[PDB]
Each structure stands twice: as structure tokens, then as C-alpha cells.
């Protein structure tokens, strides 16, 4: 299936080989996608359109922390482990992105997983799991306990590097973005900072925005698309989570700066951060790592005022965020869920047509 | 039993009638205390010394929000719902204080609790439960699922106004503070705010500090207390946190409540601790008069100027004093406990405490 | 003179009558523009291309505070009085926007201005002047004391409602934005919340961005424009200050939210916030006013979860910011300054031709 | 003159040799103290009781930045260069502490000083002077231009290592703390983490707090001290107006350490200052601008070069961090008391008189409490 560039959408910058967050070496991504039931929703009975996406910054067997920093665009949502990130500039264990109704279950499941996977002496370090959410309330039985501990273990255990599945998968399964089908998107940039190449990888769980605000490559596209409006039975709280990985050896305060750039990439695509739209970004470094109870490893150190290096990284965040958002839309297929609510994937043919008209 | 004042510990300011957070009208507190098993710990089998404490800002039947603001002393811990507080200056639903291992269970149970009670069209507002933790790792089987959904429902449904149980109860059950038994403490102040009085109520879940730093009424007391050192199976032995909840009936805006929360640190400072590297120390303040009807117009009965020192300083002083006293009240309320692996932590000795206070304050 | 709309640039939303920050009733703006000297720069002798811009939130005679909140995109710059805003949610007195070298002079001049102007009993309230800066280092003798107390007094006293002069004036005099001439820009939006209308006014002092990132109405325009690159002798640190005024009766924490929306408007126009780019936003309400030592006046109260109202206001900030930035570019004319550095105003004829091609 | 310890005030921890911020090697401190005029205040004519205190983190000739992080207890006040610190975790140039009325003058004067001392090609780095204030409004003609550029230059140029003058000097000259004479105080702690020793030095400009809240060594001492209330024209300030605690207070805390800390770790250091302040009883008034800035002298960033981080500390290394944190709390606590002891009775503008906390009484109280 084509991704955004393939359909003729131009973006600046050079992607990594996978054009995904896994272009940052050692990052692993796993999804569990829960799709079951059809028709009228009854709380506790589905239909279910939900899941969880796991990102292991250093791979699933790592006990070490990664340097990290975050930013908030609009904080009407949940992302656990963030007080820790703010305070000590690192987090341990994986990042879970899921649906709002699943947060508690995923949080406890991550602890349980640690008990069976992590040495008991290290369990102490597994007590502040990182779990974030967007709300799949149109397509999913949010309160209905559709996600199980086993689903979470499967995502934790199944995570891998290499190409990342996008669209209606994992935490993104039941999401809606720009009034089209929401979901998971990812992109990366390889940036040149003088004599060194660094990678910036971004994965988004997109559940935000309005059709009439959407811009793709600067084109206000909602009015240009014909049909594809959501339906109920056949008749015609937002959020966005942004995860940024880099192999640049950044300190925590520098990673906050990286996270703060995501908003500019979001800005490019037209949304204005709704009052109840939980829009968050978290950035981590895979080269600035903190062995559990050990000496932090900082291979090289970058000056914040080194604009050559920092600007290349910041530009990478903005570009990869912009593209990750479009990649999501293009990856996400039309879906009918709870109460026969139907949300369309942004139509490829119309998008390709629009890009040709605008960028011969 | 005696609280700190009853042992002759002096504090400044005028407490409310209950000297508890429930002196703020309409606030309800519930505990579920889970104490079971003895001897060697096996994960999933206890012993359990844990629980959950529930605070309903406007009572358990309220669907409305309260204006709120928070502060971090040291952020190595979890407190959910706080991004919401930072952003829109309010939170819906109860505050849950619990042990670290219980956070996810309590979070999901709070959502479940709303289901069937709250109108389906209002369920959306129940999706960001406020849950905070400290770690009961020495006395409790943290990962062992000792806390059940039913325990959480019981605290949510059982909460009430009036006197608040302190000590080894609810979320404070298995906690350790200043190397003595930790737990729940509470206090209040009625403050004279210019031409009006307001109540500031504070509840703490204390799992922080070192005996050698502890000051009570300014007295460095660790060295004055004889014995009472923690034991491992009856032999003297060779991650902390502190949660502070501030309620006030002052009609404060969210940014003003952040200021209130930031005062908690000064009260903590009076008692001598220095906020350890891994010590998750947080404060959350809410107003019970600045309320936000679900999907309606905020109700702000009166408005206060941040530069009104007469009014703000009285409230700020209230936070400091009530925090300071709530911490000492916790110590006094918490009794010696033996828990997992026969780990034993002593309640600060009342007889010794009284003797010291009498000696220092004739 | 033509503004961006007059050149055929499309924008969304409805501007107020003046399409300026002064569409918010009672707000006054004054500029002092200091242009003297030519040729080689010698510190203390010019040439000078600098100035100061004053914004009186409630007019120059007011001793009252306005509810306020700020946001930081990238904090490598100065903006005084902001600790006060963060703490008590208000500031007293005018906003001054100026060149980096003038901050201290402007700061003390604002205090001086209050002396005699303000009853001695109220002088306490004048001790935390709000002064912000961008760096006019290429066109101006920054350290050369080109701005005088008299210049500052003139701006304070000469400030007025009505049309706001844009371009190479006041604090924007010697600025450079997107590798074109920088300066002052302004725009406004009248926003609808049910039946209630509010105005959101924005004024920018723009000294940020690269030509190759610039996007006007989504068009990446730097590559489409021919010539107009900066020169020195005829041979071919940034910042952006955003001031947001609204007559919505917002509380301070809500105004922080408004300020955080500015970054999204900046994002639309393509920049990525350089490592040394001081990019800040300050938002204030002219209806939520705090009489000195009195009761705050809050005529109405808005629920943060009132999407209808808040989103209208948010959309307004984003739109007015986007347009203020383009208005700045269009209003700023080519200038030669210190060391014969020459910076071109973005070419009107080319911009119009490009906009006509893109938006028939 | 005696400092707090010499009056029998006990403190925990081990001070550096100087028990001052200059126990952190290379830190230099300079004061310019402006005291002139007596009697009725006329704006523009004095009397003046003001000044400026300069702290050069790496010495007056350094062009390099220090890693830094800040904390706000109550933000009703000014401290410039702090957006820079929050964003990039360092600041260049000196810290200046002064009276509120002098902020702009000092800010511009520091730039002017740079023009003199700094290579033209490095001037770009001197654009965000760090200037902080407390308000000397009871003893000083705040708006009256008492401070001159020459005063600032003298503090900048005169700054040095070694013993740091405390009390009514530099920025502290006209200040009032706990209803006694305010001013400059300093202390340090040498802390142990394994075989590693670090120094934490603290300097404060104190203009905060009320006598009724003051605790020294945990003793609530305001009621134990007899007399020494502030006076105006020869009588004790009393009545529904003149008899209430001062507002428009402030406290500036500067923390230096030679521990190689990253900026976010220095923010944590700065947040510890509040606990030290708390020990001494104050509750941060609504208009009390109370701020802390912490910097490292070992984690330095040469201008345009690579940051130098000679060692690295894990935030979760409780042994190391807790020693440093405890160091900040203790040094802050002691600096505040050292300030009170160093500041002598002063009469200033409008014949306002503020007493230094009485040494004889303090010593007697301490001797009774700690026999």
C-alpha cells in the first residue's frame, strides 16, 4: 500500500531508509489491534475498535533508561510517567499508546509484564510505566473492557524493528483524524550536523483535527475532497500523541526543545489545538542512555547554541512530524465500528489528483 | 486517640472544628485498608499492607469539576489527571491516593465506578481519573494485586465528611515516613482573609523523609527519640514520596490554586526533609467554591486579587501551617506495624514525643 | 499601502475593522523609529536602525492590570515582567517591544515615565515594566546607545488606537524575517461563539525564519521569488515576539492557552524555531481587568471545556498570527543599514503574481 | 565580625573554609554600596540606601557559559536572563543582584561593560545580562537614580574570590528581612558522595519574611527578642497601617556548585532552596518575589565550543544527589541567618529605622536553647 510520498505528496528533507521511527537504531514497535463485533454498542459488549501500540526505546530486553523531554500543545488528556521525565530527564521501560478506556489496564499490565520478564531486583524500576491515550469513542466501546492483559503482553513481546505498520493498528485502531480515519503514522529524517549523521524518527497516534483545517503540503484539502464524510448507519474529545526518537546524544532539556518543535509540524497541517484536544509530544535519545543504577552514557555532547546541529535536529522533528501525520491519513482505511459509525480513509485517488494539480 | 496537639506539640494558627480536610464543607474522604497475611512475601500472595484513600472534592454525587492547581516538589512519582489540571485548571471526579502497584487498577476502577451511575452522555467527563501514589514496598507485596476493584468501590462509596481517620489507613496503610511509620495525616486552618474567613484543609499521604532530618515544632527529634529503629524480623536493620492534597473554600482561580500548592513545600521544609532524589513529592490544591458545572458556566461566587496580600497571605500561611501539622498528625496517628517479610516500622513513640515537647516548650 | 490581502494572499476568518491589534477596543500602539547614519558601523556612532514599540493594553492613562498569560516557543531572548505574569496572572503598564541593545534603557525609561505620571501612592505598581526584544544586529549599531529616553517617552505618549503602522517602524525598524526585511505586523479576527462575538488582535515583531522555509498561504514561496537576497556593499540571532490582545473575559490560565496557540500560526508559515531564535507569545484580556489594589473585574466567565467558545478564540489566535506575519513582510520595505547591509522587502509584484497563479 | 555560628546558632553539615559562595573555586563576588543622604525622601534626591552585588560564575574574564537551572518560589519580581536559562540551560556573563529601581540601569551597564572588556566577535554573547532585584522601598529612594553606571562597573571590576562581605552591602544595602535589617548572606557546604567531595555555595539577597514567622535553628525567635521593632521618626511603627507586616518583599538565592550537573539537575538544586527557606519560617507572601538560580562551575560551555562535562551524575543516584540537595537546603538556611547577623541597624529614607537582629539577645536565646 502506498504511503504519502508515493501518492505525490511532497515533503522536504531526506527520510531514513524505513521512513519510520525504527530508523532510529534499536527502537522497536509493536501493535495489538482489537477489532471485533458490529452494530449497536452496548457498554461491556463492544463493538471494539481499539488496541495498544508499544515503543521500546532501546528494545524489549533493555532495563536501561533513555534521556527524555516532553512538551504539551494542549494537556486535556493523559500520559503517565511524565512527572518522572520532567524531574529526572529519563524514563524506564516502554511507551504504550492506547485508547483512553484502556489506560489503567495497560498501566497495570505493563507492571505485570515486568514481573514475568524483568529480573526481580530490577522490578523497582518498573513502577512508573509510560502510557498515553487518545479517545476512540466514535468507533469503540471505550468503557467496555475490550483490551485485555494478553493484548498488551502480545504488543510488548511482538515489538520489532524494521518497517512499521501504520493506519488502523494498535492504539490508533479506532481513531479519527481531520474527520477522516485516524490512526498510527510514522516518518523519519536523516539529518547532517556538520560531520555527523543523526536520525530523527517520529510516530504519531492521531485523533485530532477538523476536515476544513487540514492542510497537506500546504494545500487546504478538505474542500477539494468530494464526499468521504463520516456516516451513521449509512447516513451522512480529540487528541494527538507524538513520539520522537533520535540517536542524537541530547540532554533532557535539549529533548524538551525537540518535543516543543512538534507543534510547528502540527501547525503546518492546519489544526489549531481544540480546547479538549489532548495534544502531547515526548522525545527521547537512544544514544544518551542511563544504565539502571549506573553512570549515564553520553557518547558526545552538543551545545544548545550550536545552531548547525540543533537546527538540523529541530528541522528534522518538524518535517518528520508533518509527514508522519500525512502518512497516518494515507495508511488508515475506511472503518465501520460501534453503532455502525463509519469513518472514511482519506481517498487516495482524490489526494493523488489534488497533488498532481498542485505540484506538476 | 491523641493527635499531635494532644501530646503537647505546639502549632500556630486556628484549626477548623475537625482539624481535618473535611473542615472544608462538602469534602468527603473514604479509605479502604487492606491488611492481611504475615511473614515471608511471595509476589501475588502478600502479605498485603496497602489500600486506597478517596477524596471527593464536592462529594461523591457530584459530576462537576473543581478549580485546581498543582505543584511539584520532586516529580519522581505518578499523579494522573495532572495534565488536565495544568491545562484547563480543573479536574472532575475524586482524588485517589494509593500504593504504587495499585495505580492502574484504581485508575480503571474509577472509570468502571462511573459506568451505570453517570448518564452515558456524561461518561466522557470521567475519562481522566486523578490517581496518585507512594510506594509501600517494604511492608506490602507491591506487585501482588492485593487491591481489588471492590476495595476501590468501597472507598468511593464509603467516603463521608466529618472526622477523618489518620495513620495506617487507606493509601497510607503500608507507608514509612521519617523512618517511623508513615500513613495518612490531616489538618486544617481557619484563616482570616481580610474581611472574610476561609478554611484551608490539608490531607497528606506520607512516605518520605529521614529520621535524622525530622523536625517537629522546630525540634530536631530523631536523636532525642531512643530506639524505635526499623527492624527486619525482630532484628534492628543495618523510593520515597509524599502526596499533599489541599482543599479550600476560598473562591480561587486555577493559577491562584497553583500558588497555594507551591506553599506546601514550605510546610514540608519546616519539618526538615530535603526532598530526596527519588522522593515523589507533589501537592494538589482545589477550591470547593469555584466549581465548574459539567458543560456549564463556571461558578465563581467571589473573586480575589492575587496582589491582595491580606487575603492571599492568610491563605498561604494556612497552607503552610496545615501542611506542617498534617505531617505531624500523620506520625502520631500511625501505629507500629509489622508487614511483609516481618519488616517492622515503629510509630513515633507518644511518650517520648510528649516528654520532648514538654522539655522544649515549658 | 497594500497589506497582504491587497496582494491577493488569502486567509481564513473575519478580520476586525482595522485588521489590527487595535480592533480590541482601548488598546493603543505607539512607535518611535530611529533611522540615522549610513555606511561603516562603529559602536557608539551608528548607523542606527532601531526603535521601540509600545502597546498599552487599556490605554496610556490606565493604572489597572490586565489578566495575562504567556507561552515560549524558544526562550533564547528577553521579555521582562514575565515572572509576574506566570505568578499572579496579570501585568501593569505598557508592553515595550524593542531591539536587544535597548532593553535596559527602555526598562528604566518606563519607570521614569511613571514618575509624576502616576500618583506616588501607586508607584509600587510600576516596578516591573514589560520589555521584550529581538536583535537588529545586521542593520543597527546594537550596543551604540541609539535609543534615548526621549524616544521611549515619545512612543509611550504618542500611542493611540486606530490603524497601526506596520513594517520598518518602532521595535521592528532594523529587523529581518525569512531573509527579507522584518518588522512589525498586525492582524485581528472577530470570532463567533454562538451569538457572542469577541475580538482577537495580534501584533508581531518579526526577526525570525529562513527564506527557504517561508510559506505564505501554504505556498513555499522563497524559491518562487527571484532575487531579493540580502547584500553587503551590493554583493549577495533571530527572534519573534507575538502580542495577543482579546476582549474575551479570560482567566490567566486560559490566556496561557491562547498564547500557546501562536506557535501553530507560526508553524503554518513554515519556520522551525532555530536554536537561538527567541520566540515568545504574550496574551492579555482587556475585559478581565484588575483595578490597582481592588477587586478583579471579570464581566463574564468562560468554561475551558466550552469548545464552541474556546475553539473560536483559538482559531482566531492562529489565524491572526499567521496573517500578522505576512502583513509584516508586505509592510516592510527594502532597507540599507549598518555596514551597507541591504535587506529587501518581499517583492510585492512577485508575491501578487504568485498568489494570482495559486489562487485564481 | 561574628557570623551566625559565632553567636552560637547551630547548623548541620560542613561548611567550606570560607563558609561562603566563593568556596566554589573561581566564583568572584563584588559589591557596590550606595549610602547617602538622611531624612525626608524626595524622588530623585534620595536618601539612597541601595547598591549592586555581582557574582562572576567563572571569574570576571570568562567568556564562557555555565550550566544553570532556576526555580520560582513566588514570581512577583524580576530576574532577567531566565528565559535563556530555561531554554538552553546556561547563561553567559555575571549575575547582578540589585534594587528594583536599578534593574534597567544595571542591565544596560552590563552591556556597556562587555563592550569594554569582550572581543568584538564575542559581543553577540553578551546580549542577555542576568539581573535580579529585591525592593528597598522603605530605606531607599527607589525611583531616584541613586545607582550609576560607575557603581555597576566598580562591582563588576572589583569582584574577587575569598571572604564575601555580608549584611548591608551591594544589592542588600537597603533591604529588610523578617522585620529586621535585610541584606546579603552567604554560606557553603562541602558534601560527600562516596570518595567524591563537592562544594555547594549559596548567596542570598534577603528582603523577605516577617519577624513573627522567623525561625532560627528551629526556634521561633521573634517573640523571644525584645524591642528592635522598626521605627519611623524616632517612634516604633505601629497602628493599623504602619504596624502591619511589610509587603512587596523578595528573596534572591544564588547557588553555585562545582558538581558537574546538567541543567535539569540544576533546576532540581534550585528547587531545594524553598525547603531551606521553609525551615526558617516564612510562607512566601503574595507579593514576595522569591527566586533561586543554580549553576555549575565544572559543567561549563566555552563560547561556541563543546560543553565540558568532566563527569556525569545519574539523577537516580540518591547518594550523590541527596548529598547535594541537603547541601543546598543547609547552605540556604545558614545564608539566611548569616545575613541577619551581618546586617546592622540602619536609618534611611523618611527616617525609617530598621534594626539588625540583636546579637546579645540572639546569643542568649541560642545559649539557652542549645546548652
From Swiss-Prot, chain D:
Heterooctamer of 4 heterodimers ((alpha:beta)4); each heterodimer is composed of an alpha subunit and a beta subunit processed from the same precursor. Transmembrane segments: none annotated. The lineage of its organism: Bacteria, Pseudomonadati, Pseudomonadota, Alphaproteobacteria, Sphingomonadales. It comes from Sphingosinicella xenopeptidilytica. Optimum pH is between 8 and 9. Autoproteolytic processing to generate the alpha and beta subunit is required for self-activation and is proposed to use a similar mechanism as substrate cleavage. GO terms for cellular component: periplasmic space. Keywords: Aminopeptidase, Hydrolase, Periplasm, Protease, Signal. Its EC number is 3.4.11.25. Changing residue 290 to A: Abolishes precursor cleavage and reduces enzymatic activity. It is found in: Periplasm. This is Beta-peptidyl aminopeptidase BapA.
Amino acid at each position: 500500500g502506498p504511503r504519502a510520498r508515493d501518492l505525490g505528496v511532497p515533503f522536504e528533507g531526506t527520510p531514513g531508509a524505513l521512513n519510520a521511527i525504527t530508523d532510529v537504531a534499536g527502537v522497536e514497535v509493536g501493535h495489538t489491534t482489537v477489532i471485533s463485533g458490529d452494530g449497536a454498542m452496548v457498554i461491556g459488549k463492544g463493538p471494539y475498535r481499539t488496541g495498544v501500540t508499544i515503543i521500546h526505546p532501546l528494545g524489549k530486553t533493555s532495563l536501561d533508561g533513555v534521556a527524555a523531554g516532553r512538551a504539551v500543545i494542549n494537556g486535556t488528556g493523559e500520559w503517565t510517567g511524565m512527572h518522572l521525565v520532567d524531574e529526572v530527564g529519563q524514563f524506564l521501560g516502554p511507551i504504550a499508546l492506547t485508547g483512553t478506556g484502556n489506560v489503567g489496564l495497560v498501566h497495570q499490565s505493563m507492571m505485570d509484564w515486568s514481573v514475568g520478564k524483568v529480573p526481580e531486583e530490577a522490578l523497582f524500576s518498573r513502577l512508573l510505566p509510560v502510557v498515553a491515550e487518545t479517545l476512540d469513542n466514535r468507533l469503540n466501546d471505550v468503557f467496555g473492557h475490550g483490551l485485555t492483559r494478553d493484548h498488551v503482553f502480545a504488543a510488548l513481546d511482538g515489538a520489532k524493528g524494521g518497517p512499521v505498520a501504520e493506519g488502523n493498528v494498535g492504539g490508533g485502531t479506532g481513531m479519527i483524524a481531520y474527520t477522516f480515519k485516524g490512526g498510527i503514522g510514522t516518518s523519519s529524517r536523516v539529518v547532517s550536523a556538520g560531520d555527523t549523521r543523526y536520525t530523527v524518527g517520529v510516530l504519531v497516534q492521531a485523533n485530532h483535527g477538523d476536515r476544513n483545517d487540514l492542510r497537506i503540503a500546504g494545500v487546504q484539502i478538505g474542500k477539494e475532497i468530494k464526499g468521504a464524510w463520516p456516516e451513521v448507519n449509512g447516513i451522512v474529545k480529540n487528541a494527538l500523541l507524538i513520539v520522537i526518537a533520535t540517536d542524537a546524544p541530547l540532554m533532557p532539556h535539549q529533548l524538551e526543545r525537540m518535543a516543543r518543535r512538534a507543534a510547528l509540524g502540527v501547525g503546518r497541517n492546519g489544526s489549531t489545538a481544540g480546547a479538549l484536544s489532548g495534544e502531547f509530544a515526548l522525545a527521547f535519545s537512544t544514544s544518551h542512555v542511563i544504565p539502571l543504577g549506573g553512570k549515564p552514557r553520553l557518547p558526545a555532547i552538543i551545545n544548545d547554541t550550536d545552531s548547525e546541529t540543533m537546527n538540523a535536529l529541530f528541522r528534522g522533528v518538524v518535517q518528520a512530524t508533518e509527514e508522519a501525520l500525512v502518512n497516518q491519513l494515507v495508511a488508515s482505511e475506511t472503518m465501520t465500528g460501534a453503532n455502525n459509525a463509519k469513518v472514511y480513509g482519506i481517498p487516495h485517488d482524490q489526494l493523488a489528483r489534488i497533488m498532481k494539480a498542485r505540484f506538476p
